[PDB]
Structure formats: structure tokens, C-alpha cells
């Protein structure tokens, strides 16, 4: 529960550049592992990230999921906690979120990490 | 006016008297978008720990005089003004609203960035 | 309320009922910054082709040197107009810039104004 | 001509991503070839871009120049026109401009290239 440190918002392609750091990964539920202790989220540009759980799911997740955790040595994310975004008459646009992720990183001085 | 911000920007503001400067530009009324991690119903005020991922959760206070607590893990839009005690900054909010549409959350990122760009010096 | 725009945003506005809209937002009095590509003085008006790189130069008109010279960066404050499916501005202020940083900040005003004015 | 098409405001780093595309490159003049058939401009990040001309350079440019041309296969720019920025009263902040360029490419829904 690294909730008292800054967690960087990233996408798949940034996994390898954030090994061992707290990150926040928002993606769409693609697949749940038979055991329920892992699942894959695809980011706004169609790329996949592997999310590892300490405890198995108790409910079936779907739609947009926001994961907070630490990137492991194998470029997966070891989840500390996750939330499932809700969606009203307006569906969540993952494409634009990926863009805000690319912007966040283009302007670190206007979106400081801690 | 109201400047869109991140808690990391807030915790890095300097009080040059009783007035706050966000890096270089004065500011007081601000907006943030985050998740309630914890909610504490005190006597006359509800205190929330809101988190936007940019730093540790921040204390956001709401003076509520005589059903008003937003549940934890709910994404919210907070609007108030920056405050400070013995160096520990907080937020007094006139508004804390559960985000109906999460795209409003992504838009805030855009607003924060284009607000510190166009107001930078 | 004046809205800073790019010539490309002006071209995409929808003249429907009688007014203009860049979405479902009414628009009329705007601002742009571009280069003066051509000047044509006439007894009751001056027409300039102002270029902000976002499209082909747009027609900007001023009622009744007096005429700003080509290759001059200018700031225009005017009203949106339209012939047979073709836009132009009737300018009431066409001030050549003294500070080009005003050009840079207009790009930022545009982006901010069109962000905090969308659906 | 190109003056009737949209031209993207770029910086040296975007040349590779804009080959054969009409662009507008703003920069400080680094050097001008003797004949005036080619000059170099450096951008808000200090990186250079070379400007080729079909015709010899009439005047002799100086400070911050704004070029309109189409990027060649060799990642340079074939110039169709250019203008020198006015700097006699206020110096042009080339660095803030570069941040603007980055924003234009990051928020195209709010700064459209087209019509």
C-alpha cells in the first residue's frame, strides 16, 4: 500500500522504464487468469500489461480498471490495489486517457511527480 | 480565478506572507480531481484524505454545520482554496462532487497542464 | 465575450439557424493572429488575407500607412461572416504586433478557450 | 500552392515524423551559405534544421526566422517562403514557443490542422 508515495501514470510501453517504481495503470480488462491472481489490461493504444495480485479476485472485473502497484523485474505490475471505473451514458475514452499519459510525461514541470 | 491543480503542485506552493505561490504564480482558489481514500466525520467538519497519485493523499476539509460524507474509493472533484498551518497545507472545500463521468478526470489532467503553461512566468 | 481562435476553427463553424457554432456553442466575436499576405484598399473598405498556418489565408475586412504592409504579423478583433458557404471576418481592430510573444501566447489562449468551451 | 494548405508548426525533432509534409519551422538563424541558397536555423531546444531554397536568398536574414516549406526525403526543408520575426522592442522567447509547439501537437482537438 504505497499510497504515500507518488505513483506515475503510465502505459504498457513505459513498463520497462519504470522497473521497481510505484505506478498507476489504467486499462481495459482483456483476460482473467484461471486462478484469479492475475489479469491483463490493455492500455489506450491497444498494448497489454500484466497485473499480479496478492489475493485472488472475489468478483469478475470488466470495463476500465485502475491499478496501483509496483513494476516487478519482469515488467508486470504487482498490484497493491485497484478500482473499476464507472460509466454513465458516456463511456470512458481510453484513447484520450493514453494521450493525457503522453502529455503528463511531455510536461513533467506542469504535472510534477511528488 | 480558479486554477486546476495536482496535490503535488499544492504541497509545493510557498506562502510568501499569508499568500501562496504555485512555483512562481500566486494562487488561492484551486480545483483537484482525486479518489477519497479515507473519510472522517468529525464534529462540525468532515475531513477527507484525497489522492490524485501525484503525492501522498491530501487533507481536504469541509465545514459542515448541523448524510453528508462521500464514501471512500469514490472519484471526486474538489474545489476550494489552499490553506496552511504550521507548514502542513490543506484544502477547505466549498465543493466535493462525485465524478459522474470519468472522462472529466482525464480532462482535468489536460486543464492542469494548460493552466500552468498559459499562466507560467 | 471574445473567443481567441485559429482560422481552421473559424472555417469549421456551422452557420445554421442564423448564427455560428463551433459545436453547440454560439460564436461570433473572435480573435486571431496571422500574417498579412495581401492588402487591397477600397473607398469604403480594406480587405486583407491573414494567414495563421492552420489553413489557406482567410479574408479579413476593415471598413473605410493606413493599410498594414504584407509580411506583417497582426492581431485581429472581429466578427464572423459568411458568403455562399465561405467565411471571413469583419474586423474592427487590426493591430500589427509589437511583441511576437503575443503570437505565442495567443496559441495558448486558443487552446485554453476551446478546451473550457467544449462538450 | 502550399500557402493554401495547413502547415504544421514543428521543431527539429519532428522533421523525421513530417517528411514530405508542409511545415512551419520557427528558429534562430545559425548560418547562411555564401550564395544564399541554404541557411540553418536552431530551435527552442537548440537543435538545428537546415533550410534549402530554390532561389538565392534576396535579403540577408538574422534573428528568429519563420520558414514555410515542405520537408524533403533527407529530412531538411525546401523553403517556399519565410519571414523574420520583429525583435526591436521585445526579444522573442524561443523556449516558450517550443512549449507551444509541443502543446499544438498534444492537443490537436483544440488547435486543428485543416478545415
From Swiss-Prot, chain A:
Cross-link (Glycyl lysine isopeptide (Lys-Gly) (interchain with G-Cter in ubiquitin)): 21, 37, 86
Gene Ontology CC entries for this record: DNA replication factor A complex; nucleoplasm; site of double-strand break
Record key words, sorted: Acetylation, DNA damage, DNA recombination, DNA repair, DNA replication, Isopeptide bond, Nucleus, Ubl conjugation
InterPro entries noted in UniProt: NA-bd_OB-fold, Rfa2
Transmembrane regions: none
GO biological process, alphabetically ordered: base-excision repair; DNA repair; DNA replication; double-strand break repair via homologous recombination; mismatch repair; nucleotide-excision repair; regulation of cell population proliferation; regulation of mitotic cell cycle
Annotated SUPFAM superfamilies: Nucleic acid-binding proteins (SSF50249)
Any one GO MF annotation of this record: damaged DNA binding
Main location: nucleus
Modifications the protein undergoes after translation, according to the UniProt entry: Ubiquitinated by RFWD3 at stalled replication forks in response to DNA damage: ubiquitination by RFWD3 does not lead to degradation by the proteasome and promotes removal of the RPA complex from stalled replication forks, promoting homologous recombination.
Record flagged with keyword Ubl conjugation: yes
Subcellular location, record wording: Nucleus
Pfam families reported in the protein's UniProt record: Rep_fac-A_3
The family this protein is said to belong to: Belongs to the replication factor A protein 3 family.
Subunit relationships: Component of the canonical replication protein A complex (RPA), a heterotrimer composed of RPA1, RPA2 and RPA3. Also a component of the aRPA, the alternative replication protein A complex, a trimeric complex similar to the replication protein A complex/RPA but where RPA1 and RPA3 are associated with RPA4 instead of RPA2. Interacts with BRIP1/FANCJ via the RPA1 subunit; following DNA damage they colocalize in foci in the nucleus.
Function: As part of the heterotrimeric replication protein A complex (RPA/RP-A), binds and stabilizes single-stranded DNA intermediates that form during DNA replication or upon DNA stress. It prevents their reannealing and in parallel, recruits and activates different proteins and complexes involved in DNA metabolism. Thereby, it plays an essential role both in DNA replication and the cellular response to DNA damage. In the cellular response to DNA damage, the RPA complex controls DNA repair and DNA damage checkpoint activation.
Protein name: Replication protein A 14 kDa subunit
Species of provenance: Homo sapiens (Human)
Gene: RPA3
Swiss-Prot record, chain B:
Post-translational modification: Differentially phosphorylated throughout the cell cycle, becoming phosphorylated at the G1-S transition and dephosphorylated in late mitosis. Dephosphorylation may require the serine/threonine-protein phosphatase 4. DNA damage-induced 'Lys-63'-linked polyubiquitination by PRPF19 mediates ATRIP recruitment to the RPA complex at sites of DNA damage and activation of ATR. Ubiquitinated by RFWD3 at stalled replication forks in response to DNA damage: ubiquitination by RFWD3 does not lead to degradation by the proteasome and promotes removal of the RPA complex from stalled replication forks, promoting homologous recombination.
Annotated localization: Nucleus; Nucleus, PML body
Upregulation: Translationally up-regulated in response to DNA damage (at protein level).
DNA-binding region location: 30-98
Similarity-based family: Belongs to the replication factor A protein 2 family.
Subunit structure, interactors included: Component of the replication protein A complex (RPA/RP-A), a heterotrimeric complex composed of RPA1, RPA2 and RPA3. Interacts with PRPF19; the PRP19-CDC5L complex is recruited to the sites of DNA repair where it ubiquitinates the replication protein A complex (RPA). Interacts with SERTAD3. Interacts with TIPIN. Interacts with TIMELESS. Interacts with PPP4R2; the interaction is direct, DNA damage-dependent and mediates the recruitment of the PP4 catalytic subunit PPP4C. Interacts (hyperphosphorylated) with RAD51.
Function: As part of the heterotrimeric replication protein A complex (RPA/RP-A), binds and stabilizes single-stranded DNA intermediates that form during DNA replication or upon DNA stress. It prevents their reannealing and in parallel, recruits and activates different proteins and complexes involved in DNA metabolism. Thereby, it plays an essential role both in DNA replication and the cellular response to DNA damage. In the cellular response to DNA damage, the RPA complex controls DNA repair and DNA damage checkpoint activation.
Protein name: Replication protein A 32 kDa subunit
Gene name, Swiss-Prot/TrEMBL: RPA2
